[PDB]
Write a protein that binds this ligand. Structure first.
Ligand SMILES: COc1cc(C(=O)O)cc(OC)c1OC
Length: 186
């Protein structure tokens, strides 16, 4: 099926705990996959205007590891719960993708998780201004604007609201789309 085929594909790019012990400042992100109307979607947040780093920007749920976390996946789940209400029984963590190195001293580890069909986002307004879905297929033929560097513009046909997606967030979305959608019979 669609979901089982997505997980089998994702498991082949799983690096595991390989890079997890290295002595970095550590952050984790969740890439949440949602099935709606026969198709896979990614869930995104718009950061609150009040935040210190990157107010008003599109990003995945995530943040900094703390001493309670058993592992890097636990960081991602804890942060997703606190930002958009996502509970642990509502997410299956499928795999750990290649981490991102930033600023010489920081490592960001992304996890892909399948989200239960009955989940509804309760955004925390102190951290999250907005939550939205994008069809996974969009990342194969995006609408690109050059800022000189590449920015994606997505218009939700439900309400005509346009979002800008860029940087690490845009790169990870394209990656996940390639992994799951490349080479499929129609
Ligand atoms: C996981 O949080 C981050 C995300 C990004 C980003 O590029 O989206 C940049 C960061 O630092 C420069 C972050 O914290 C270190």
């Amino acid at each position: 099926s669609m979901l089982d085929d997505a997980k089998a594909r994702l498991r082949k790019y799983d690096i595991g705990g390989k890079y997890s012990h290295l002595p970095y400042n550590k952050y984790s992100v969740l890439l949440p996959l949602v099935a709606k109307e026969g198709k896979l979607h990614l869930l995104f947040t718009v950061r609150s205007e009040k935040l210190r780093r990157a107010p008003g920007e599109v990003c995945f749920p995530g943040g900094k590891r703390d001493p309670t976390d058993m592992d890097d996946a636990a960081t991602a789940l804890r942060e997703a719960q606190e930002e958009v209400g996502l509970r642990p029984h509502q997410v299956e963590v499928v795999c750990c993708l290649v981490p991102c190195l930033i600023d010489t001293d920081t490592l960001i580890t992304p996890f892909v998780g399948l989200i239960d069909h009955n989940f509804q986002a309760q955004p925390n307004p102190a951290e999250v201004k907005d939550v939205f879905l994008v069809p996974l297929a969009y990342f194969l033929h995006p609408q690109v604007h050059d800022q000189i560097n590449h920015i994606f513009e997505y218009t939700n046909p439900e309400d005509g609201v346009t979002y800008q997606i860029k940087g690490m967030t845009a790169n990870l979305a394209v990656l996940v789309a390639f992994i799951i959608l490349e080479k499929k019979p129609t």
